Design a protein around this ligand. Structure first.
Ligand SMILES: [Cl-]
Ligand SMILES: [Cu+]
Length: 187
């Protein structure tokens, strides 16, 4: 169980480290009282490295994550999300104990967006974690975001999944021996 600390999520005060409900009832963004309350607006220039960091009680052997954008500031189940980074393996970390960045790429227009971090844990229950944050891209090719484990598509335990459509910005941070094969079916 983990949650995003940077960028600062919407509704930080009520955001917990639980995965999305298995029945899809709180997709997207962990629908609740104040799902889309701006705690702190996050701001990024195109091409600027931005920190992506996480806190929680178990990394579940890592797994794979995406960072995605939508123009909707109150996304619904029908929102269009586009991927700007995939991390296949090693996300959010490899081990528990007492690192990542993203960049807004050329092709994203200045404006206000919602950013989502999504995570498919390697080990344990077949879950999807998702936290959303307000992002302003200052100044004012990208595939659809992968969804599994909350929509009847179930991933395989033990592997760092490869997203069918990872986009052109991909990082690998896990053990090569756990990485699913290129072209493998994720669910
Ligand atoms: Cl941990
Ligand atoms: Cu957990």
């Amino acid at each position: 169980h983990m949650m995003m600390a940077q960028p600062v999520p919407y509704g930080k005060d009520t955001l917990n480290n639980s995965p999305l409900a298995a029945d899809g009832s709180d997709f997207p963004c962990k629908l609740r009282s104040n799902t889309y309350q701006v705690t702190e607006e996050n701001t990024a220039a195109i091409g600027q490295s931005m920190p992506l960091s996480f806190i929680g009680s178990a990394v579940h052997g890592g797994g794979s994550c995406q960072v995605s954008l939508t123009t909707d500031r109150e996304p619904t189940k029908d929102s269009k999300w586009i991927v700007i980074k995939s991390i296949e393996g090693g996300c959010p970390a490899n081990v528990d104990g007492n690192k990542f960045t993203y960049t807004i790429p050329e092709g994203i227009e200045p404006g206000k967006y919602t950013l989502a971090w999504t995570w498919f844990n390697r080990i344990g229950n077949r879950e999807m974690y998702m936290n959303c944050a307000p992002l302003t891209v200052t100044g004012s090719n990208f595939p659809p975001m992968f969804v599994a484990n909350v929509n009847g598509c179930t991933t395989k335990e033990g592997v760092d999944i490869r997203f069918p459509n990872p986009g052109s910005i991909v990082e690998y941070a896990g053990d090569k021996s756990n990485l699913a094969a290129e072209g493998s079916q994720a669910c």
